[PDB]
């Protein structure tokens, strides 16, 4: 699994860098696993160059890891993330909304249902507005209310929508005491400008380090089971050079170097959210044939009647004294080929 999750991490970071070019000096927040899961699922029904491009854009090399190993790895990944863990809520699922008149291969349907937990819905896309609400409501429900209004616009000729959703809720191993939270503390948003945020404060032992190559502080806060948060705080003006270095190799290094010790720690209490139109981004990164009129999804429908048209992601984060709640959803839209 780890060689997969290492490739998935480098995809995360490469995509993160594309975002710092598209929306620079702005909040970024996404679920790399949601985006990867959705695209891998889209690849399950693709063939030939259409399938190849998707998984290569995801960062896999078909010599090192053949298509079947990739498919089997992602099935074991989703299954593992969903396995019941005490004191941690984590669920990642997906749903395929299929046009009433499409001819889906009952092979592909039975296999996504049994192997990726996929929920399948016959959708009347001739009521494009009602369909949009149904999907949005399904995603809202499955992200425990946190991801509202995923799909803003849905093309009139949509005949399939694939959604992936992730919800995460967990308690800090060491929760903050709200009576020690400072109501109004300064946070630097640029050289000369501050905003006011609640600043949580605790004195405890944490795994942390100062990366002496990259000139940033890394702080790890564990959740009470099976999960952690890493905070990466560059020295002033060093954020670009930390961003350029982020990689699976860097994460492996920090995993080795992180040491537990006492820290006087101040962390902001806050919420953010971000949305991404991913259509063009994915084309650039190498997913080309999936959008063309010669798209090959012969594994999906009898008549290979569709092509990808649009893709979008929405993610939200809340951090407070008790822990973290985060959610995300990925949206892939198909129209007639």
């Amino acid at each position: 699994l780890y060689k997969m999750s290492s490739i998935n991490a480098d995809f995360a970071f490469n995509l993160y860098r594309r975002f710092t070019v598209e929306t620079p000096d702005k909040n970024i927040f996404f679920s790399p696993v949601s985006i990867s899961a959705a695209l891998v699922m889209l690849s399950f029904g693709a063939c030939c160059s259409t399938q190849t491009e998707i998984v290569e854009t995801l960062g896999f090399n078909l010599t090192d890891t053949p298509m079947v190993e990739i498919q089997h790895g992602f099935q074991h990944l989703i299954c593992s993330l969903n396995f019941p863990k005490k004191e941690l809520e984590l669920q990642i699922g997906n749903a395929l909304f299929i046009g009433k008149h499409l001819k889906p291969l009952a092979k592909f349907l039975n296999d996504v249902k049994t192997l990726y937990e996929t929920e399948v819905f016959s959708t009347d896309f001739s009521n494009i507005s009602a369909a949009k609400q149904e999907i949005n409501s399904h995603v809202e429900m499955q992200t425990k209310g946190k991801v509202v209004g995923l799909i803003q616009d849905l093309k009139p000729n949509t005949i399939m929508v694939l959604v992936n959703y992730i919800h995460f809720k967990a308690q800090w191993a060491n929760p903050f005491d709200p009576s020690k939270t400072e109501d109004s503390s300064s946070f630097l948003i640029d050289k000369t400008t501050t905003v006011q945020v609640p600043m949580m404060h605790q004195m405890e032992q944490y795994y942390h380090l100062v990366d002496m190559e990259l000139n940033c502080t890394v702080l790890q806060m564990d959740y009470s089971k099976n999960a952690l948060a890493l905070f990466v705080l560059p020295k002033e003006g060093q954020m670009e050079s930390v961003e350029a270095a982020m990689s699976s190799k860097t994460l492996k290094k920090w995993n080795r170097l992180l040491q537990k010790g006492w820290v006087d720690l101040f962390v902001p209490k806050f919420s953010i959210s971000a949305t991404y139109d991913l259509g063009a981004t994915l084309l650039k990164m190498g997913i080309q044939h999936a959008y063309s009129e010669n798209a090959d999804f012969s594994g999906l429908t009898e008549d290979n009647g569709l092509k990808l048209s649009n893709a979008a992601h929405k993610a939200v984060l809340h951090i407070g004294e008790k822990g973290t709640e985060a959610a995300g959803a990925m949206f892939l839209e198909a129209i007639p080929r």
């Binding site: 890493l230 994460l251 101040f266």
Partner: protein, 35 residues
């Protein structure tokens, strides 16, 4: 004698699941009160 860590300017955040080594969420907080 203890180091002070103050998350009081722009930072990157990662949320990782341990057993699979998955990055569940990835981001940068430039302005935590934005929008």
């Amino acid at each position: 004698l203890h180091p002070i860590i103050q998350i009081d300017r722009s930072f990157m955040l990662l949320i990782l699941e341990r057993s699979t080594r998955s990055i569940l969420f990835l981001g940068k907080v430039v302005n935590p009160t934005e929008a």
